[PDB]
Write a protein that binds this ligand. Structure first.
Ligand SMILES: Cc1cn([C@H]2C[C@H](O)[C@@H](CO)O2)c(=O)[nH]c1=O
Length: 207
């Protein structure tokens, strides 16, 4: 039937080689003549980036959990219509830094919002669309490393970030067919060799 690309999301903390690994993946794909679209959430479009700004900017006014969740999904709705679905329809590979798993992990695990409510909004915004593959970069939580000023989420405590970590691992266990957990605590080349063994699988998913 209708045109098909490949929707890959990457999840995990910065400082875990997510970005260099995404670049690696992108170059390996592009050398094979495949169109690759790099993007990130929240953000990805002019309006979505403005929503991002509201989400990250520290304020003395506390942001309600529901506000934070609805803003995340608002940016996502804009980003899906403007960037992601159009790329997939061109048969491109989308490599998206963070997606709805981050919502489950941060807003669910970190903020304590019920999984059911996040799931309701996921279906509302996305219909049946989910990533084809989600790469989780897992390693023990590191706090305070390489830190203008801390944004809203950076200000959180170690407990918050441990809940985020564990939620990703839980999610990957609930639907193993959609995830691959990468040991981001392993040497740099050893992880990119994992990416090599992955490429053929990606290519198959794509064509
Ligand atoms: C995509 C996404 C990011 N975040 C956080 C993680 C980062 O701290 C920040 C920017 O990606 O926003 C969420 O809390 N929920 C989400 O759904």
């Amino acid at each position: 039937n209708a045109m098909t690309g490949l929707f890959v999301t990457l999840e995990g903390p910065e400082g875990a080689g997510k970005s260099t690994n995404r670049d690696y993946l992108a170059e390996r794909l592009r050398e094979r003549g495949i169109e690759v679209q790099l993007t990130r959430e929240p953000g990805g479009t002019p309006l979505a980036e403005r929503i991002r700004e509201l989400l990250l900017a520290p304020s003395d006014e506390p942001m309600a959990a529901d506000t934070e969740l609805l803003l995340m999904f608002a940016a996502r709705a804009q980003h899906l219509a403007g960037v992601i679905r159009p790329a997939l329809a061109r048969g491109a590979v989308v490599l998206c830094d963070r997606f709805t798993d981050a919502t489950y992990a941060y807003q669910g695990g970190g903020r304590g919002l019920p999984e059911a409510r996040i799931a309701a909004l996921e279906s509302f915004v996305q219909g049946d669309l989910r990533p084809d593959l989600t790469l989780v970069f897992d390693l023990p939580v590191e706090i305070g490393l390489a830190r203008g000023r801390l944004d809203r989420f950076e200000q959180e405590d170690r407990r918050f970030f441990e809940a985020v970590r564990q939620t990703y691992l839980q999610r990957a266990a609930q639907a193993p067919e959609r995830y691959q957990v990468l040991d981001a605590g392993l040497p740099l080349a050893e992880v990119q060799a994992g990416l090599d063994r992955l490429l053929p699988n990606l290519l198959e998913r794509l064509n």
